[PDB]
Design an enzyme around this catalytic site. Sequence first.
Site, PDB file in Angstrom:
ATOM      1  N   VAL A 112     -45.716  39.114  -7.202  1.00  0.00           N
ATOM      2  CA  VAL A 112     -45.067  39.724  -8.516  1.00  0.00           C
ATOM      3  C   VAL A 112     -45.709  40.978  -8.697  1.00  0.00           C
ATOM      4  O   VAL A 112     -46.929  41.287  -8.581  1.00  0.00           O
ATOM      5  CB  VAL A 112     -45.353  38.658  -9.605  1.00  0.00           C
ATOM      6  CG1 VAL A 112     -44.725  39.202 -10.978  1.00  0.00           C
ATOM      7  CG2 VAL A 112     -44.800  37.577  -9.527  1.00  0.00           C
ATOM      8  N   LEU A 117     -49.383  42.006  -9.641  1.00  0.00           N
ATOM      9  CA  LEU A 117     -49.859  41.211 -10.576  1.00  0.00           C
ATOM     10  C   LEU A 117     -50.580  39.708 -10.008  1.00  0.00           C
ATOM     11  O   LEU A 117     -51.356  39.347 -10.501  1.00  0.00           O
ATOM     12  CB  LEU A 117     -48.794  41.001 -11.682  1.00  0.00           C
ATOM     13  CG  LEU A 117     -48.288  42.176 -12.469  1.00  0.00           C
ATOM     14  CD1 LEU A 117     -47.189  41.790 -13.273  1.00  0.00           C
ATOM     15  CD2 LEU A 117     -49.359  42.585 -13.431  1.00  0.00           C
ATOM     16  N   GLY A 118     -49.973  39.335  -8.980  1.00  0.00           N
ATOM     17  CA  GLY A 118     -50.148  38.203  -8.309  1.00  0.00           C
ATOM     18  C   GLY A 118     -49.695  37.878  -6.846  1.00  0.00           C
ATOM     19  O   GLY A 118     -48.393  38.466  -7.063  1.00  0.00           O
ATOM     20  N   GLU A 119     -50.142  37.258  -6.128  1.00  0.00           N
ATOM     21  CA  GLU A 119     -49.518  37.133  -4.702  1.00  0.00           C
ATOM     22  C   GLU A 119     -49.605  35.337  -4.580  1.00  0.00           C
ATOM     23  O   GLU A 119     -50.442  34.747  -5.027  1.00  0.00           O
ATOM     24  CB  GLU A 119     -50.479  37.576  -3.767  1.00  0.00           C
ATOM     25  CG  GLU A 119     -50.282  39.041  -3.656  1.00  0.00           C
ATOM     26  CD  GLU A 119     -51.375  39.648  -2.901  1.00  0.00           C
ATOM     27  OE1 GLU A 119     -52.519  38.984  -2.424  1.00  0.00           O
ATOM     28  OE2 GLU A 119     -51.100  40.839  -2.267  1.00  0.00           O
ATOM     29  N   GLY A 120     -48.440  34.807  -4.269  1.00  0.00           N
ATOM     30  CA  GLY A 120     -48.034  33.592  -3.823  1.00  0.00           C
ATOM     31  C   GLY A 120     -47.915  33.387  -2.382  1.00  0.00           C
ATOM     32  O   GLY A 120     -47.993  34.264  -1.526  1.00  0.00           O
ATOM     33  N   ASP A 175     -46.143  22.329 -11.804  1.00  0.00           N
ATOM     34  CA  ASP A 175     -47.352  22.850 -11.386  1.00  0.00           C
ATOM     35  C   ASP A 175     -47.973  23.615 -12.522  1.00  0.00           C
ATOM     36  O   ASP A 175     -48.308  24.783 -12.374  1.00  0.00           O
ATOM     37  CB  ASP A 175     -47.026  24.052 -10.235  1.00  0.00           C
ATOM     38  CG  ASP A 175     -48.469  24.281  -9.508  1.00  0.00           C
ATOM     39  OD1 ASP A 175     -48.286  25.242  -8.488  1.00  0.00           O
ATOM     40  OD2 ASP A 175     -49.202  23.582  -9.468  1.00  0.00           O
ATOM     41  N   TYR A 202     -45.021  32.840  -0.716  1.00  0.00           N
ATOM     42  CA  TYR A 202     -43.800  33.626  -0.141  1.00  0.00           C
ATOM     43  C   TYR A 202     -43.444  34.884  -0.631  1.00  0.00           C
ATOM     44  O   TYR A 202     -42.310  35.150  -0.747  1.00  0.00           O
ATOM     45  CB  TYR A 202     -42.726  32.683  -0.196  1.00  0.00           C
ATOM     46  N   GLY A 203     -44.344  35.565  -1.305  1.00  0.00           N
ATOM     47  CA  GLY A 203     -44.369  36.896  -1.983  1.00  0.00           C
ATOM     48  C   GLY A 203     -45.247  37.067  -2.851  1.00  0.00           C
ATOM     49  O   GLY A 203     -46.447  36.688  -3.254  1.00  0.00           O
ATOM     50  N   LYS A 216     -40.608  39.749  -9.235  1.00  0.00           N
ATOM     51  CA  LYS A 216     -40.953  38.783  -8.383  1.00  0.00           C
ATOM     52  C   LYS A 216     -40.295  39.069  -6.989  1.00  0.00           C
ATOM     53  O   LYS A 216     -39.101  38.925  -7.183  1.00  0.00           O
ATOM     54  CB  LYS A 216     -41.065  37.090  -8.914  1.00  0.00           C
ATOM     55  CG  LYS A 216     -41.583  36.310  -8.068  1.00  0.00           C
ATOM     56  CD  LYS A 216     -41.168  34.883  -8.776  1.00  0.00           C
ATOM     57  CE  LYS A 216     -42.127  33.888  -7.901  1.00  0.00           C
ATOM     58  NZ  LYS A 216     -42.175  32.788  -8.632  1.00  0.00           N
TER      59      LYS A 216
HETATM   60  C1  LIG Z   1     -50.864  38.660 -14.568  1.00  0.00           C
HETATM   61  C2  LIG Z   1     -49.261  38.434 -14.743  1.00  0.00           C
HETATM   62  C3  LIG Z   1     -48.434  38.824 -15.360  1.00  0.00           C
HETATM   63  C4  LIG Z   1     -46.905  38.657 -15.488  1.00  0.00           C
HETATM   64  N1  LIG Z   1     -46.129  39.273 -16.370  1.00  0.00           N
HETATM   65  N2  LIG Z   1     -45.003  38.441 -16.058  1.00  0.00           N
HETATM   66  C5  LIG Z   1     -45.173  37.873 -15.106  1.00  0.00           C
HETATM   67  O1  LIG Z   1     -44.243  37.079 -14.380  1.00  0.00           O
HETATM   68  N3  LIG Z   1     -46.706  37.954 -14.569  1.00  0.00           N
HETATM   69  C6  LIG Z   1     -47.520  37.133 -13.801  1.00  0.00           C
HETATM   70  C7  LIG Z   1     -46.940  36.441 -12.635  1.00  0.00           C
HETATM   71  C8  LIG Z   1     -47.758  35.775 -11.734  1.00  0.00           C
HETATM   72  C9  LIG Z   1     -49.022  36.079 -11.781  1.00  0.00           C
HETATM   73  C10 LIG Z   1     -49.917  35.241 -10.771  1.00  0.00           C
HETATM   74  C11 LIG Z   1     -49.412  35.011  -9.494  1.00  0.00           C
HETATM   75  C12 LIG Z   1     -50.097  34.488  -8.585  1.00  0.00           C
HETATM   76  C13 LIG Z   1     -51.224  33.838  -8.803  1.00  0.00           C
HETATM   77  C14 LIG Z   1     -51.787  34.243 -10.137  1.00  0.00           C
HETATM   78  O2  LIG Z   1     -53.063  33.827 -10.661  1.00  0.00           O
HETATM   79  C15 LIG Z   1     -51.207  34.781 -11.047  1.00  0.00           C
HETATM   80  C16 LIG Z   1     -49.685  37.054 -12.562  1.00  0.00           C
HETATM   81  C17 LIG Z   1     -48.674  37.487 -13.676  1.00  0.00           C
END
Ligand SMILES: Cc1cc2n[nH]c(=O)n2c2ccc(-c3cccc(O)c3)cc12
Length: 261
Positions: free
Chosen positions: A22, A14-17, A122, A19-20, A37
Amino acid sequence: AVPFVEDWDLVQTLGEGAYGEVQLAVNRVTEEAVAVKIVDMENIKKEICINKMLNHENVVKFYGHRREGNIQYLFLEYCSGGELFDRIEPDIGMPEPDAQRFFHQLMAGVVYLHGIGITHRDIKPENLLLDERDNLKISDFGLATVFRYNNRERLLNKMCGTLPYVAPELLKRREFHAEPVDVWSCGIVLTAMLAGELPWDQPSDSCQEYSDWKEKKTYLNPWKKIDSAPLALLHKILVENPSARITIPDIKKDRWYNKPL
Ligand SMILES: Cc1cc2n[nH]c(=O)n2c2ccc(-c3cccc(O)c3)cc12
């Protein structure tokens, strides 16, 4: 977890930070979705602690966590509407009514957090997710901290936020009040929603675009794309002196904020 992955498919990232990442996990039998995460040991220790305090409709729900070697796994509400960023058309933004509705929900979330003495630090569209009914959910408490213990505020001093969203006092003052910093980034989010672009790299003297804003040049982008009613609110939010900056109770009195669209 090895048993978890036997019953749950880690479908996609779903996303990259820093230090890891999701991931989307889906239970094979029930088809329940949860966000996982994964953090290789953002302050993950404080993140868990803060997540345990939260309970609000506009905050990403925290289900639990566990350690597996040096890796920390946080289990979070899957927000199936995606990210706020993907409702923002570049250089255009989104319809004003949509922006207004999201902004109300953002305020609801921020008011809740501030009410329990927590600052996110943030706030940006990447950290504002959407559920299946497009309800806004504040996400990622890796940089969050406590600015009020019971009824006793402390000043903060850490410069951890994403620069285009950071308030000018973080570049000028050794210590500062938490709440106006979050209010500032909310205003940058509103600007992005209404214009599809960020006004400046950073709110410094040396940044021309910031100077242009200070000098009321609202005939330039992104401001010239923003109607004067919402612009009037941005005028009160993006105030350099945090002591003169609008507070959330006064945002609730703003004409555009309360304008039926
Ligand atoms: C797309 C999404 C769904 C979600 N559902 N529950 C969660 O923690 N997430 C997420 C949590 C984080 C991120 C993320 C992470 C890094 C960059 C960035 O731009 C987005 C997306 C999601």
